[PDB]
Design a protein around this nucleic acid. Structure first.
Length: 88
RNA sequence: ACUGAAACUGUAGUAGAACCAAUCGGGGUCGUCAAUA
C-alpha cells in the first residue's frame, strides 16, 4: 500500500456502504513579467518573469464562522438581519 | 492573535525566394440523300 496524501474526502456515515466522495481543487499556473522601462523589455535587473499558481474561478468553498451565544446576542440586538451583511 | 506590497509575457524578426498562362491548330471546303419499279 501507499498512503493517501492530499485532496479532500466528502461525508461518510457509519454505514456509508461507499467510499466518500473526493473533491479536487483545480489550479492553474499564471506567468507574468516585469519590464525594464528604458529598454521596454524584461531584463535580469528587473527579475524577468515570475509565476503564480492560483485556484481558478468557479471553485466553491465552505468556511464556518463560529461565535458564542453572547456575541450573537450582541449582534442581533443591533441588527436582526445581521447574517444578510455577510453577503459580500 | 489578522490577506504582504510592487512587477505589461514582453523584446528583435518583410510569408518570403524561384517560376513566361503557356503549347498545337490555313476561317476551311463537293456529292451526297431517299428506295423501289
Amino acid at each position: 500500500l501507499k498512503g493517501e496524501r492530499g485532496g479532500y474526502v466528502g461525508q461518510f456515515e457509519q454505514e456509508q456502504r461507499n467510499l466518500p466522495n473526493t473533491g479536487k481543487i483545480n489550479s492553474e499556473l499564471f506567468t507574468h513579467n516585469t519590464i525594464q522601462d528604458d529598454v521596454q523589455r524584461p531584463t535580469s535587473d528587473v527579475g524577468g518573469v515570475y509565476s503564480y499558481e492560483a485556484i481558478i474561478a468557479g471553485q466553491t468553498f465552505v468556511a464556518e464562522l463560529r461565535l458564542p451565544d453572547s456575541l450573537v446576542k450582541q449582534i442581533t440586538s443591533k441588527n436582526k438581519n445581521w447574517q444578510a451583511q455577510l453577503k459580500a
